[PDB]
């Protein structure tokens, strides 16, 4: 995309996140999802 945002983002969160969920997720929806909005 030539008109994709070409600016830098130094304002992203620079902290570490050890507090995210460390559990495995085996019962997440394993089906294919071709019905998601394919537009921009």
């Amino acid at each position, epitope marked *: 995309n*030539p*008109n*994709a*945002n*070409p*600016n*830098a983002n*130094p304002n992203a969160n620079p902290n570490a996140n050890p507090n995210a969920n460390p559990n495995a997720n085996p019962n997440a929806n394993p089906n294919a999802n071709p019905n998601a909005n394919p537009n921009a």
Partner: antibody
Amino acid sequence: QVQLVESGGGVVQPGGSLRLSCAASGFTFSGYGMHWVRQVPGKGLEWVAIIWFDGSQKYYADSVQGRFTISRDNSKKTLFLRMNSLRAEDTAVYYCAKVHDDEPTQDYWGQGTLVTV
Amino acid sequence: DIQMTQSPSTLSASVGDRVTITCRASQGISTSLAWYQQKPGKAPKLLIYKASSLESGVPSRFSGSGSGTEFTLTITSLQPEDFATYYCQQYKRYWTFGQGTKVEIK
């Protein structure tokens, strides 16, 4: 206080080469994208090329594809456009341009130089 | 690329008047079209981005709206410093500019 200046203009023979420069100041040039927009006087504008902030990506118009090279030098806050195999139709007023923060539009244009063949 | 057209290409008005400029293009966008101003011999400066929002430093007199392929610029209480050639632009694809419309003194 976005200050943009352009140099390297003048007259060149057809088929020759010329090299433009765009010094920048008043903003973090190291992290912003750059544009080159040219204007044939008495007519409308036509976009030339875009260079990403880091310099990895770069695009051009079809009429200028394969002949014009856009480059950056983040150390000295200067934007270049290497111009090769110039022709009579390329004579126009060339402008340096600044990418907006929100959408990839152009906000501030330098005074620009006139290139003649 | 996107094809850009403006109408009328030249308009005449006095001070304190109310003027519109129509920007018509193919390749339906509805979101991303600009507005500009270019004094003769001067570099262009941005006036309206996202076709509805003003850039900082632009007075409240300038206003733009539209969706689809119909886009317009509204100028109320016309002032002497506004007499220039207002251009048009879009970003949804490779950038292309319009032909340019100039507002004159009536």
